[PDB]
Design a protein around this nucleic acid. Structure first.
Length: 43
DNA sequence: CGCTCAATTGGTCGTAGACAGCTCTAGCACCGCTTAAACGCACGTACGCGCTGTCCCCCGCGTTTTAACCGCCAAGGGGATTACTCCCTAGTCTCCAGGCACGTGTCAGATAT
């Protein structure tokens, strides 16, 4: 891949997923993952 | 009375902006197909208030010759243009900052599975 690691936040990712899925990743890093505690969330 | 001169209108180079074919997505009302409502085209059937020539005087018109006026002649002097002089605010673009909308929040206290 031409550029390696991308830095993001949950408010962007829940809208931008359609763009991010245009590129594959080897590994996912998910920081303060308690942001995902609600399975009811759109996030 | 047709030149020389001081300036554009128009021509060639430039450079990146503003198109229009992708390159698909995926949301949706268009197209297909029966179902079903009710009135459109059909249409008698009542009988008419536009037009056809009598009788009689009204309005428009031609003619006439005054005399006001528009088209025109030239000049009058002050205010719009052509151009220089200088002062500011229109646009750039910036960061600040806040209303509308979306979303997680959460857990409470009002309602029901």
């Amino acid at each position: 891949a031409p550029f390696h690691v991308v830095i993001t936040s949950y408010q962007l990712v829940v809208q931008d997923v359609k763009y991010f899925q245009r590129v594959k990743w080897q590994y996912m890093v998910l920081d303060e993952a308690q942001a995902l505690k609600s399975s009811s969330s759109v996030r």
